[PDB]
Curated annotation (Swiss-Prot):
Regions crossing the membrane: none
Interval of the full protein contained in this chain: 262 to 313 of 469
Quaternary context: Component of the U4/U6-U5 tri-snRNP complex composed of the U4, U6 and U5 snRNAs and at least PRP3, PRP4, PRP6, PRP8, PRP18, PRP31, PRP38, SNU13, SNU23, SNU66, SNU114, SPP381, SMB1, SMD1, SMD2, SMD3, SMX2, SMX3, LSM2, LSM3, LSM4, LSM5, LSM6, LSM7, LSM8, BRR2 and DIB1.
Protein name per the record: U4/U6 small nuclear ribonucleoprotein PRP3
Subcellular location: Nucleus
Superkingdom, natural source: Eukaryota
Miscellaneous comment in the UniProt entry for this protein: Present with 432 molecules/cell in log phase SD medium.
Described function: Participates in pre-mRNA splicing. Part of the U4/U5/U6 tri-snRNP complex, one of the building blocks of the spliceosome.
Length: 52
RNA sequence: GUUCGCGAAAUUUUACUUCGUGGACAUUUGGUCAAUUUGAAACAAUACAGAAUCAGCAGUUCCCCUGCAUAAGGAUGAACCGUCAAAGAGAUUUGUUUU
C-alpha cells in the first residue's frame, strides 16, 4: 500500500561479496566494508536496545 | 507386348537386325501452413512459421548458541536488638582530682 518503506537486503560479512544492489561494492572497497559492518553492529544495537 | 543377359547368321570382334533362350515385368492413399480481403465463387493477393537471460534478500518448518520479559520453583551472602511531633492546664523534687 505504500505506508511502509520497501525493505533493503540484509548484508553480512559473508553475503557482503555478492550484493551488487548498492553503489559502493567493488568501486570503493573499504567504505563498503564500513557500510556492511555498521549495518551489522546496528542490528545488534537494536537487539540490545530492545532488551534494555 | 517392355527392358537386361547368353548362343547363331548377314557385314569390319564391341554395334544394328533377326532367330533360340534366363529373370524382371501394378495403380493410388496415408502429402491441405495457420492468420486476413462487402457477395453470383476461384486460389488470386496479404502476411511467412522471428506465429528474453544472470544475481540478491526476505518469508514458512525444525535445531543450536546468546540475551531480556514472564510464570512458577530453588541455593547463598549481607554485624548488633521497635509497646509519635507541638502547645496549654494541674501535682512533686532541686573549701581541693573530671571543665
Amino acid at each position: 500500500l505504500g505506508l511502509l518503506p520497501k525493505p533493503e537486503p540484509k548484508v553480512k560479512l559473508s553475503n557482503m561479496m555478492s550484493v551488487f544492489e548498492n553503489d559502493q561494492n567493488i568501486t570503493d572497497p573499504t567504505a563498503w566494508e564500513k557500510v556492511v559492518k555498521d549495518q551489522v553492529d546496528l542490528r545488534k544495537r537494536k537487539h540490545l536496545e530492545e532488551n534494555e
